[PDB]
């Protein structure tokens, strides 16, 4: 009901461009401290950047033949560990960065080494080789099929990977402190697209093409099935309070789910002429979320979760961000918010990452 003018602050302008990648930038991720950006793309390189200036401070080529599909930081500030998926491997590395003191390096290495010696398998843990080791890449985890999604648990000892063509092994939970990889959900039936942990509870969301399955992690049992009513789900994100979802789809529908009231969508939002590639909630208290589409644009929304005063979520579109160039019918592929500020970064098929504020 309110107008965008009353709903400040939200990003309106392009302010920093990250250049260096060749081919599509498939993923973007800002470090836990909001100081650095991480990117991965077609050229199979992972690149870490000085966020506001847009300076590349570190990079590594993990695999010559495989593009980096996704990059996700470990959400802990006591370490500086970055995860990257290329092909069927997961790489855990410590980017060379001014924040990495001798102390922080050691703390990070200890976290990566702890699992060692804990008494076609789901996961293969090993050193990645001297070349990658020299650049700070310390672990390679090999799963059965190509990885399209990485999702950390907030405490940073668990992370999930999703391989849409892995069939029975499409969804894996990895435990860092044990170097353990499990396939805990065996009749999931449908093509797993992505997954996420829960911000406050021991729950786990798995998105298939048409629905999102919610699991009890303690019992490994299905609790409920969220029904977005989309023909192909591309992405979803959980609100920090754990009771709300935004869902993106190739059908071009953006969906808000009020989990407390029903398993069907509360609102359906169509602001794109092409498929939606990614959705992301701001995780630091600002009532904002955004979607990314192949039409080259990002739509920023005002989204307030229900409370005392609010019987329903207040959803108001505030700004559409344009600037990414569409290449081969691909536009914006990934989004991430700053931990505290109303700033978002976008992954572009045009070979760039762009900072908006």
């Amino acid at each position: 009901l309110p107008s965008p003018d009353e709903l400040k602050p939200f990003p309106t302008v392009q302010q920093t461009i990250f250049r260096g990648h060749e081919g599509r930038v498939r993923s973007v991720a800002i470090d836990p401290t909001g100081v650095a950006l991480a990117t991965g793309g077609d050229d199979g390189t992972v690149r870490v950047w000085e966020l506001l200036t847009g300076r590349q401070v570190w990079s590594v080529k993990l695999n010559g033949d495989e593009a980096v599909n996704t990059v996700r930081w470990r959400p802990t500030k006591d370490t500086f560990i970055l995860a990257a998926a290329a092909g069927e491997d997961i790489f855990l590395m410590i980017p060379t960065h001014p924040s990495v003191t001798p102390a922080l390096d050691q703390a990070s290495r200890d976290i990566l080494n702890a699992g060692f010696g804990h008494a076609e398998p789901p996961g293969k843990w090993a050193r990645p080789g001297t070349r990658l080791e020299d650049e700070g890449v310390l672990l390679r985890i090999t799963v059965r099929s190509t990885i399209k999604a990485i999702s950390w648990h907030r405490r940073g000892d668990h992370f999930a990977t999703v391989s849409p063509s892995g069939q029975r092994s499409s969804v894996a939970i990895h435990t860092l402190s044990k170097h353990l990889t499990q396939i805990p959900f065996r009749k999931l039936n449908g093509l797993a697209q992505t997954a996420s942990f829960h911000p406050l509870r021991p729950l786990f969301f798995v998105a298939t093409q048409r629905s999102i399955r919610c699991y009890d992690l303690q019992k490994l049992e299905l609790v409920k099935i969220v029904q977005p009513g989309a023909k192909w789900i591309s992405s979803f994100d959980v609100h920090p309070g754990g009771d709300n979802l935004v869902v993106g789809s190739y059908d071009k529908r953006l969906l808000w789910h009020d989990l407390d009231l029903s398993n069907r969508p509360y609102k359906t939002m169509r602001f794109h002429t092409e498929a939606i590639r990614a959705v992301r909630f701001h995780k630091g208290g600002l009532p904002l979320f955004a979607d990314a589409s192949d039409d080259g644009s990002l739509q920023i929304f005002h989204g307030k979760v229900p409370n005392d005063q609010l019987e329903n979520p207040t959803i108001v579109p505030v700004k559409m961000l344009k600037g990414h160039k569409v290449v081969n019918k691909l536009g914006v592929l990934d989004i991430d918010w700053h931990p505290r500020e109303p700033w978002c970064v976008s992954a572009g098929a045009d070979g760039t990452a762009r900072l908006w504020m």
Binding site: V13, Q14, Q15, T16, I17, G34, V35, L52, T53, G54, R55, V57, P98, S99, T101, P102, A103, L104, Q106, G323, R340, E341, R354, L355, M357
Partner: protein, 460 residues
């Protein structure tokens, strides 16, 4: 015939006028042109051709006097108090210093520059001033008048910086200070055999910060250094090995936890976000001001190492600068929200009477005050431009801030000559190839370095 006239009262800040001749009858249709030759008359000040501008209640006079009267609620027999000022001699492009990488920092060693004055009170210079340039390649460079490199800092392999340099300033003609992504602050000694040959040798390696050291202020009299770092801490340092404590050995490049290695006199983690600025108070060296992305300006008592005051603005702060008015302390704070905020450190929060400098289209990451006009200063932004401000120019705020405080607009815009050279009338988006990282205003000129790998010189 008696043309319609306006009564005016001339007043000024700049030495002035005899009170006998300050009130005057003047043609209502007159303009800035006519009013300044009246000021340049035999009668008034007998200055032949000094160009003047005129401020009326905080606004410059771009049209005739009557137009101002009708624009407002004045009645053409209202007495206008026009305060006249020197017209800004436009700082046009003059030269560029080419680098192979991004220029992160800029500073000038001149007779009037702070380091030059400290030097006189070790050597001093006549017509041979030096320009210091830090680069993301990790090397400092010293330039002279004709834009040629006199000296260059040694690489990391030889005791130099082992990462990109973020900030660097002249302490004196004798000593430099620099900081960067290697979490160190390095004190240098500059020697010049002859005026086209120089040398930089590391005096101290200073350890302390847990992240990139991005901001640097120095005092050449006491040999002290202020630093703001991404770790959210403000560092207070001595540039002499004698008064500098021993380092935290865990922060040393040796640990797996030649040049003397030392620590800070004070390192205070007073911010919940990257510390973007830290400067000495112009009036009192015992006092320091810090600015950070946590939206706060904090005042530091250096002798006790305590936060005696905290000011909380609306937006993240990326740059800070101190002004003389010593009638009061006055700071300029560059914001990530593309504007500047003028503040008095002890306010606790911004009153309705707060001044804002608008015009920039990107992050303002650098600031420098005018050497000759106390009321003026220059800003450096990621939009690729440098904007000159006159704090005497001020109007009420519009619906932009919903009529909160007052707003000043630039009196000049220094464009990036690298971009302007192409003749294109379409600007880089997001400061694509032209971001400005550092600007310094000296009487020798306005020097600005940035992403375009150039130190750009502007002067009248």
């Amino acid at each position: 015939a008696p043309v319609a006239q306006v009564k005016v009262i001339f007043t000024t800040t700049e030495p002035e006028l005899p009170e006998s001749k300050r009130q005057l009858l003047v043609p209502a249709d007159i303009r800035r042109y006519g009013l300044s030759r009246i000021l340049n008359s035999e009668s008034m000040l007998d200055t032949g051709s000094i160009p003047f501008d005129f401020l009326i209640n905080g606004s410059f006079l771009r049209s005739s006097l009557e137009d101002y009267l009708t624009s407002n609620g004045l009645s053409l027999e209202t007495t206008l108090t026009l305060q006249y000022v020197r017209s800004l001699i436009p700082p046009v492009y003059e030269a560029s210093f080419e680098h192979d990488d991004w220029v992160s920092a800029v500073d000038v060693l001149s007779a009037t520059s702070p380091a030059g004055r400290w030097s006189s009170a070790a050597a001093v210079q006549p017509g041979q001033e030096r320009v210091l340039s830090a680069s993301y390649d990790g090397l400092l460079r010293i330039w002279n008048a004709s834009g040629s490199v006199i000296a260059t800092s040694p690489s990391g392999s030889h005791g130099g910086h082992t990462a990109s340099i973020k900030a660097a300033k002249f302490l004196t003609s004798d000593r430099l200070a620099s900081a960067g992504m290697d979490r160190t602050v390095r004190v240098w000694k500059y020697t010049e055999s002859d005026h086209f040959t120089g040398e930089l040798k590391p005096t101290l390696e200073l350890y302390g910060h847990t992240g990139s050291v991005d901001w640097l202020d120095v005092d050449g009299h006491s040999k002290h250094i202020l630093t703001a770092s991404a770790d959210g801490a403000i560092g207070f340092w001595s540039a002499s090995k004698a008064s500098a404590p021993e380092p935290d050995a865990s922060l040393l490049p040796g640990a797996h936890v030649s040049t003397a290695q030392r620590g800070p006199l004070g390192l205070w983690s007073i911010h919940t976000a990257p510390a973007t600025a830290a400067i000495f108070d112009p009036r009192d060296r015992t006092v320091a001001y810090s600015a950070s992305q946590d939206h706060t300006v904090r005042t530091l008592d250096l002798t006790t190492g305590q936060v005696v005051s905290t000011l909380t603005l609306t937006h993240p702060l990326l740059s800070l600068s101190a002004l003389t008015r010593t009638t009061s302390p006055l700071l300029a704070a560059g914001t990530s929200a593309r504007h500047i905020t003028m503040v008095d450190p002890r306010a606790s929060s911004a009153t309705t009477s707060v001044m804002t400098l608008r015009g920039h289209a990107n992050k303002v990451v650098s600031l420098s005050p005018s050497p000759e006009n106390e009321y003026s200063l220059v800003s450096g932004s990621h939009d690729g431009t440098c904007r000159v401000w006159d704090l005497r120019s001020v109007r009420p705020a519009t619906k932009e801030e919903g009529s909160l405080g007052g707003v000043s607009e630039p009196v000049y815009v220094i464009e990036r000559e690298s971009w302007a050279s192409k003749g294109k009338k379409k600007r880089p988006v997001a400061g694509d190839g032209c971001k400005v990282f550092s600007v310094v205003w000296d009487k020798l000129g306005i020097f600005s370095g940035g992403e375009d790998k150039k130190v750009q010189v502007n002067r009248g």
